[PDB]
């Protein structure tokens, strides 16, 4: 809106001028990547089921397996993080 183009003129005027890492942001990015891969695989499989011509079965299965691998990696990382947190928060200070 008006707010949005003010923001975009601000962006350009900082770009002209040019010419804190947070763990929560990284976790959100990783979750978004896993969800995006899963959604892409699901959409491709749905389209292939509906008889779309330009999609092959081997690609569908490979994409599903890659999404499964990514989600398993996410699960294992979550398990390790939870174990570390529960170990740290169980101290006697």
């Amino acid at each position: 809106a008006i707010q949005g183009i003010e923001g975009v003129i601000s962006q350009l005027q900082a770009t002209a001028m040019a010419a804190t890492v947070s763990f929560a942001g990284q976790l959100h990015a990783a979750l978004d990547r896993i969800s995006d891969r899963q959604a892409a695989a699901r959409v491709q499989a749905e389209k292939f089921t509906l008889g779309e011509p330009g999609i092959a079965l081997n690609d569908v299965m490979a994409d599903m397996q890659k999404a499964s691998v990514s989600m398993q990696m996410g699960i294992q990382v979550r398990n390790k993080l939870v174990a570390a947190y529960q170990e740290v928060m169980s101290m006697q200070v």
Partner: protein, 164 residues
């Protein structure tokens, strides 16, 4: 509250326009031989505007490109000719963002009423003014009031003898 402040703002603007008109109309017509009053239609509405403009790039001479793929095939066997041209072009365009916040209290339409006196000679006869002098007064008042046609300004100067 705020309405009274706006009204006082309008009154001050009108009074200053009146004084500016009187200042130039005094030396030639004379002190008291001229009276003017000004009314001002003002703008107390907060407006914010963002404008985006793209330069046209439909002409190949002014078109700026980043990547271009041109596949051309001609299998001549017009006979069994077979022409095929697949063209993909990515452009970069000029861009101008303007952000404007209009001032509160601007003038929308100014109308001014001016009345002049007659000319009493040494005998005392109230001789009216002439057409050339009236035109000069009109031009001077237009200059003083900042007369413009986009605003829709109206000016009326009439000649009549003042009462006792």
């Amino acid at each position: 509250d705020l309405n009274d402040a706006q009204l006082k703002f309008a009154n001050d603007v009108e009074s200053r326009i009146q004084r500016r008109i009187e200042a130039i109309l005094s030396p030639i017509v004379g002190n008291g031989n001229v009276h003017a009053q000004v009314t001002a239609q003002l703008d107390f509405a907060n407006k914010e505007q963002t404008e985006e403009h793209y330069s046209p790039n439909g002409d190949a001479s002014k078109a700026t490109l980043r990547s271009r793929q041109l596949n051309i095939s001609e299998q001549v066997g017009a006979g069994p000719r077979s022409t095929q041209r697949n063209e993909t072009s990515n452009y970069e365009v000029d861009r101008t963002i303007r952000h404007t916040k209009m001032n509160v209290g601007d003038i929308e339409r100014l109308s001014v009423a001016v009345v002049v006196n007659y000319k009493t000679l040494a005998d005392g006869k109230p001789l009216p003014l002439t057409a050339d002098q009236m035109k000069q007064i009109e031009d001077l008042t237009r200059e003083a009031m900042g007369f413009s046609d986009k605003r829709g300004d109206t000016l009326n100067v009439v000649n009549s003898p003042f009462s006792a």
